[PDB]
């Protein structure tokens, strides 16, 4: 009947219609001919800009709901005004509030997004050097990380600006263990970072020989070369994995941080572009307990546990794996829940976005979700999401990839 | 153009060429991705052109192209389709087409398999009783007392303004669902609606868990007619685990014969709505999605509070460990009763082989992500950290609509 995609739950035989999908300006990778949802990474003229500001714009007076009123269409001649004079324009402070909060609303990937509304926003704007960005970026982990009680927050530095360099962050997140390529091929640490690992060090950071060493941050001012900072200890909060029953599992000496704050990743509003924007929440337990600890190009610590539970590794099916797995993820619920910070397991968050859904359905005519990223790395079925169809799509205000500044 | 396909557990990258050659549309257009829909939404050149690619395709597979055989193979199906707006393959041809469709099915996890499947010719069926015979024969040859074969049995093809052979039932087996007035579903809950055209149709219900279903087979043009399954052709495994003695207790058991029938096969344009086919499990099929899954049997809290675990809680992973201890008592049962079985470890292993060898052979290889990776244990297994390219060859299985 309705010209909108056809939306199935598969366990409750519920039917919706996405109509929001019709508000997508930008392409994704797919065509009629194929599809390359799976794909991870798939590959202004002031006419551009303004029709991109002016959408913006009708969002945020919409959401105030004073679309069509005097203050919208004269800010709608104040945006245009400025940006024939500068090329660019700028953001009120309630506009940047508004349009990080739907940047996260909007990301397809993630299964966190029950909490958008909650995403305090740091404005910092008026950031001036390196040295500034380390003392906002501290004081979004402090107040981030709050004593292991999380709280969701972004931190908003200078937007590009025509013939000015970036304000980048080069870490891809602001805590990150370092990655040693040994003498004998393998790594040490964290093989996901040998490259920032080599970065901070050809920068001239002293590096460590650990497994788990706390990288420096790599911050860059416009046309500046990145300045190092090392962040204090006692500001990076950290959990000890111990297992509820495995006596031995804590002798394994694993540990990992408290808090989840993306760095790399670039926030665009109204075809305005944040290169540095940071933003934390808390973790859903499967990211440390399965993609972290147990990827073969993590830190892959599958079979250390599997042996150490006496399980038969030379055989796929006794299912080692799928045990060991568990056991690990059980025990970084278990540790973080008795260190008192803030985690979510995958049967609560994927219920939890459930809600969302619904709460989308209502609100909006529909939610861009990504199911290969929205079904957790274990368990898949046994959560509710597994059964529940989406459609995906760019929608603006958005977090967006963008290529590493070095 | 053409995709970059990366593995990022590897580092490694190709390039998948063969989606070109991809002559149907998908769901996705470059607005909106809509690769988890489950189903898809909705003269007699169009014919001849699926016609002469397919024979083009047979001819290339013997290495046989621009003979003589060839060419007049050409002219015969022309011939035959200007006449009488429709053709006919002639059996190796079919042999070969049946086979296409396998390998071109992006949801597949089992398709290393693709070269080696038994075909059996049934377009001389001629009613509902010869259908049964056929039906019974491939099972007979498939189960082959445990140690699984892969078969597949061609119905006559459709023809216009003329009823379809069918199979009304998804599978060759499947246990009967019963609906208890009570809210509640006595079996399978999948199987309500052909449970209930069963019993319409006459045939006289049980009210266990495991009650095997009568096939309803349709000769065209004519009321489905019921038949049983003779019990002795059911090989079916009762499930125990190897050191909860208290498993086998629960009374569980599964078929072992996957074997689906109301998938339409289409080669060279020509279409076969009834085509049963049918494989070996693969043991999450059982123990996750048939066992587990809300909508089914779902035993996961019962088996949960047998290992004495807190349902009180989600952070107690209690789903993730009965799960795991349920895809054991299926690995377990089937190996001890010597009836083929995969284990998703090893499914995705041969799978990421099987992209190798069709990347080598023709350039690429349509998959479906979210249906190669299985259920349980996802990152654990090579495919889920392989990116794939999806698209739809032909010959091709399709979904058509239940015939009632
Ligand atoms: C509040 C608790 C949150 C939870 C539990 C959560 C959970 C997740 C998870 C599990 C992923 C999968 C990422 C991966 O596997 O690499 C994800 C992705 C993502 N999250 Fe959230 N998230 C949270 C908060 C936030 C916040 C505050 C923001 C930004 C304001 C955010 C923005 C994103 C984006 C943009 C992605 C896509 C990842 C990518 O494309 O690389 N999330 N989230
Ligand atoms: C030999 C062992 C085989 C194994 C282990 C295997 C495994 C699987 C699995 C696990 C699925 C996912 C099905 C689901 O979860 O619903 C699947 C799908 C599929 N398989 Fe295979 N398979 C095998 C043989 C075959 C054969 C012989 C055929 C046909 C000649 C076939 C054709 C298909 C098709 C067309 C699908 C798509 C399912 C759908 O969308 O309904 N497979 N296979
Ligand atoms: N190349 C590359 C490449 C590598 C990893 C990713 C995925 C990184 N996602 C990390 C990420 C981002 C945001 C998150 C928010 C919350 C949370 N708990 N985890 C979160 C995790 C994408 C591209
Ligand atoms: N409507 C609907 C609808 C519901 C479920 C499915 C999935 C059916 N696929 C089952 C299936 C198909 C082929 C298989 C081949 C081998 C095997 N071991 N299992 C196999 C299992 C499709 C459509
Ligand atoms: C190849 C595949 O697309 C890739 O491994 C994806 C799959 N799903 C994911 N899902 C989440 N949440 N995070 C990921 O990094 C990925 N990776
Ligand atoms: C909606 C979603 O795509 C749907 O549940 C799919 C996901 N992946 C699957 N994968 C397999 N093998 N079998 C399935 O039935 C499904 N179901
Ligand atoms: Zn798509």
Redesign the interface.
């Known amino acids: 009947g309705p010209k909108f995609?056809?939306?199935?739950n598969?366990?409750?035989g519920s039917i919706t219609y996405?109509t929001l999908?019709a508000q997508?300006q930008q392409?994704?990778?797919?065509?009629?001919?194929?599809?390359?949802?799976?794909?991870?990474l798939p590959?202004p003229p002031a006419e551009q800009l303004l029709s991109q500001a002016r959408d913006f714009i009708n969002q945020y007076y919409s959401s105030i709901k004073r679309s069509g009123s005097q203050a919208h269409e004269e800010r709608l001649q104040e945006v245009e005004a400025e940006v024939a004079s500068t090329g660019t324009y700028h953001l009120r402070e309630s506009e940047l509030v508004f349009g990080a909060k739907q940047a996260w609303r909007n990301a397809p990937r993630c299964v966190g997004r029950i909490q958008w509304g909650k995403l305090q926003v740091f404005d910092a704007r008026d950031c001036s050097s390196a040295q500034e960005m380390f003392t906002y970026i501290c004081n979004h982990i402090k107040y981030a990380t709050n004593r292991g009680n999380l709280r969701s927050a972004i931190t908003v530095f200078p937007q590009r600006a025509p013939g000015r360099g970036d304000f980048r962050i080069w870490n891809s997140q602001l805590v990150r263990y370092a990655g040693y390529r040994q003498q004998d091929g393998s790594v040490r640490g964290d093989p996901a970072n040998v490259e920032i690992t080599e970065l901070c060090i050809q920068h001239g950071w002293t590096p460590g020989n650990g497994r788990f060493d706390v990288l420096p941050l790599l911050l860059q001012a416009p046309d500046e070369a990145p300045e190092l900072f090392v962040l204090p200890p006692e500001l990076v909060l950290e959990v000890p994995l111990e297992h509820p029953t495995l006596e031995w599992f804590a002798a394994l000496g694993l540990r990992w941080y408290a808090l989840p704050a993306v760095s790399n990743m670039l926030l665009e509003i109204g075809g305005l572009e944040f290169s540095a924007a940071p933003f934390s929440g808390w973790y859903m337990?499967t990211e440390i307990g399965?993609?972290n600890l147990?990827?073969?190009?993590r830190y892959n610590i599958?079979e250390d546990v599997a042996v150490c539970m006496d399980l038969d590794t030379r055989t796929?099916?006794?299912?080692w794996?799928?045990?060991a797995?568990?056991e690990i993820?059980?025990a970084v619920?278990?540790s973080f829940?008795l260190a008192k910070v803030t985690i979510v397991?995958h049967?609560?968050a994927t219920?939890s976005f459930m809600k969302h859904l619904d709460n989308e359905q209502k609100a909006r005519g529909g939610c861009?979700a990504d199911?290969?990223w929205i079904?957790?790395?274990?368990?898949?079925?046994?959560t509710?999401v597994?059964?529940q169809?989406?459609?995906?799509?760019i929608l603006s205000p958005a977090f967006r990839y963008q290529p590493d500044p070095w």
């Open positions: 995609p056809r939306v199935k598969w366990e409750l996405d999908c997508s392409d994704g990778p797919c065509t009629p001919r194929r599809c390359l949802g799976s794909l991870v590959r337990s399965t993609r147990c990827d073969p190009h599958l796929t099916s006794s299912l794996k799928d045990k797995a568990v993820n059980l619920l278990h829940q397991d049967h609560a219920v861009p199911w290969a079904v957790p790395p274990i368990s898949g079925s046994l509710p597994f059964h169809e989406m459609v995906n799509y």
